[PDB]
Amino acid sequence: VNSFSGYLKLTDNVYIKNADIVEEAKKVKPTVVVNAANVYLKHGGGVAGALNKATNNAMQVESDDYIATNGPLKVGGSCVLSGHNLAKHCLHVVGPNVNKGEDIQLLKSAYENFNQHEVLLAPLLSAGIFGADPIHSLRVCVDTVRTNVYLAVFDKNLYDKLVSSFL
């Protein structure tokens, strides 16, 4: 048993809810929250800017030190950093950004990072402002992630569309 509440069960291991991932993280304090990162860990908008703002910019300070030491992530890659006041850990995962021209086949590689963690609170990757079809992103998630994933879908109307269209 875990602390996640009000999720619809899609599969053996994937759950979904209409929720702000920031508010969900603050309430649950999960072991792992996933950030929808870019390779530079520049947290400007969407999940990254919202998560970073909720940490009072501590996520960005930590991320800048990580990049100064290690250089950029790969598209499809990840790193584990602090969860600050939101979670024990933040798994920063880089899905492909369609609005920058990246290979959508890299979305599966991105979701494979989740399999290194038993339980995660996460957003849909590569959708929203990254520009991918969220219905596709949910299908890749279900077909790739084997660990227990709790998906927070910010957009109300999209949540309803994802549930109604789920196969």
Residues that bind ligand W5J (CB under 6 A): 20-22, 46-47, 50, 123-124, 127-128, 152-155, 158
Residues 6+ apart with CB under 8 A from 107: 76, 95, 96, 125, 126, 132, 136, 137, 140
DSSP code, position 62: H
Q: Rounded to an integer, what distance in angstroms lies between the CA atom of residue 141 and that of residue 28?
A: 22
Q: Is 102 exposed, middle or buried, given 0-12, 13-18 or 19+ CB atoms closer than 10 A?
A: buried
DSSP code, position 166: -
Query: Considering beta carbons, is residue 80 or 129 the nearer one to ligand W5J?
Result: 129
Residue 128 beta carbon to ligand W5J: minimum distance, rounded to whole angstroms: 4
Query: Considering beta carbons, is residue 27 or 70 the nearer one to ligand W5J?
Result: 27
Residue 66 beta carbon to ligand W5J: minimum distance, rounded to whole angstroms: 22
Residue 150 beta carbon to ligand W5J: minimum distance, rounded to whole angstroms: 11
Residue 69 beta carbon to ligand W5J: minimum distance, rounded to whole angstroms: 28
DSSP code, position 89: E
Query: Considering beta carbons, is residue 50 or 106 the nearer one to ligand W5J?
Result: 50
Residue 77 beta carbon to ligand W5J: minimum distance, rounded to whole angstroms: 19
Query: Considering beta carbons, is residue 22 or 94 the nearer one to ligand W5J?
Result: 22
User: Among residues 89, 87, 74, 90, which one has the least CA distance to residue 38?
Assistant: 74
Query: Considering beta carbons, is residue 106 or 162 the nearer one to ligand W5J?
Result: 162
User: Among residues 162, 143, 144, 139, which one has the least CA distance to residue 152?
Assistant: 162
